[PDB]
Amino acid sequence: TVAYIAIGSNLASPLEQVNAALKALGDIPESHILTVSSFYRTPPLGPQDQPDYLNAAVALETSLAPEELLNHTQRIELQQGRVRKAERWGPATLDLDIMLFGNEVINTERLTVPHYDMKNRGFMLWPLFEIAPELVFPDGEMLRQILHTRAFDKLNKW
Numbered sequence: 079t080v081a082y083i084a085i086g087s088n089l090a091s092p093l094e095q096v097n098a099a100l101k102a103l104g105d106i107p108e109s110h111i112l113t114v115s116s117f118y119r120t121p122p123l124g125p126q127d128q129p130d131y132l133n134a135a136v137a138l139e140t141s142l143a144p145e146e147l148l149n150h151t152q153r154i155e156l157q158q159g160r161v162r163k164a165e166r167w168g169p170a171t172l173d174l175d176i177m178l179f180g181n182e183v184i185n186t187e188r189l190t191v192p193h194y195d196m197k198n199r200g201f202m203l204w205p206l207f208e209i210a211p212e213l214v215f216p217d218g219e220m221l222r223q224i225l226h227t228r229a230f231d232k233l234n235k236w
């Protein structure tokens with residue numbers, strides 16, 4: 079099954095963090111990285127000069143069950159980042175989100191696929207469209223269509 083995973087970092091050298099996260103993701107059992115997007119740059123909300131976010135998307139072929147994949151992504155986040163409690167409202171060392179898992183729809187306390195609000199987050203959709211321009215969401219909506227009809231500025235590259 080192809081899982082699409084969102085990667086985000088705005089602390090401790092994001093280029094270093096995304097690269098470590100990619101390596102970790104690549105090591106997950108019964109899984110293989112199919113494709114990686116370019117790295118995008120998402121500035122913060124606010125003028126106060128806060129660190130920009132590096133965002134990416136990964137196509138991960140996997141024979142794992144969705145909750146099994148989640149066990150590894152959470153593990154990776156916990157081992158590589160999640161250093162201070164403030165990161166939940168503020169800058170983060172590493173965020174790993176499972177965006178999509180094949181055409182599955184999943185709503186458990188643990189795991190919600192498609193990811194919460196992802197259709198309204200260009201920092202997710204732009205890199206996903208780079209690697210999967212023909213993608214169709216589980217409800218039948220085309221990703222391309224979503225980007226042609228919602229108010230997303232083009233994200234600049236890192």
Ligand SMILES: [Cl-]
Pocket residue numbers: 093
């Ligand atoms: Cl850099």
Ligand SMILES: [Cl-]
Pocket residue numbers: 192215216217218
């Ligand atoms: Cl959907």
Ligand SMILES: [Mg+2]
Pocket residue numbers: 104105106107108109
């Ligand atoms: Mg392997």
